Amino acid sequence: GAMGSMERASLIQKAKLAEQAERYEDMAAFMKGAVEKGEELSCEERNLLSVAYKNVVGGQRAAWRVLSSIEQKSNEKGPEVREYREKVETELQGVCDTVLGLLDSHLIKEAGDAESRVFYLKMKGDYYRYLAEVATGDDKKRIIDSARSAYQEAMDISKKEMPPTNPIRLGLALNFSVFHYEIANSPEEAISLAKTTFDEAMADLHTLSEDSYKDSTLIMQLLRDNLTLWT
């Protein structure tokens, strides 16, 4: 693609510069180019990929929610609100499809270690979840089940291969809980997952260094925040 002529190391360096400059669309394009070099990604590099696309799709989702709310109030005028909501929606779907394409070609199939495989399967669940937030057609149930299946495989691996305080295990459980609550209309499952994840992490904190303790308790607090919101 457009980044084919740039060195992998230069793409990674520029992704870090783009993050410092809060230029997340550039950051995502640089990291897409780095993935397309065909080599596996390091821990740090996977984080850069995730940060970049999370910020891009995060702005699109926030805009879509603003426009969808205006559209709902309008249907309680002309086609413009629907048209512009559709424009933002299509761009969001394009970004999600791009990320899912990188995971499928070929990040997931080459990811053998628990840390990388769970990371990418969590990403796959997340981006199918973002597709599910805007879905309304014949394939909406299949989109939801694609999110569920990816989260579920990641959960099964993380429970077998990682300690309960592992940050990627915690962040996966957090997001699968949000999937249950917001997408699958399963609030009891969401609450049960968040509580069991929190409690089993709490019991494993004694094994950690001060720095690992900080990392794990930060994500546990997000689980606690959702539990307080939901109960």
């Binding site: 997340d126 957090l174 949000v178 925040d225 939901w230």
Partner: peptide, 8 residues
């Protein structure tokens, strides 16, 4: 409000 998914 909307719930927290993982965020930095």
């Amino acid at each position: 409000r909307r719930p927290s998914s993982w965020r930095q």
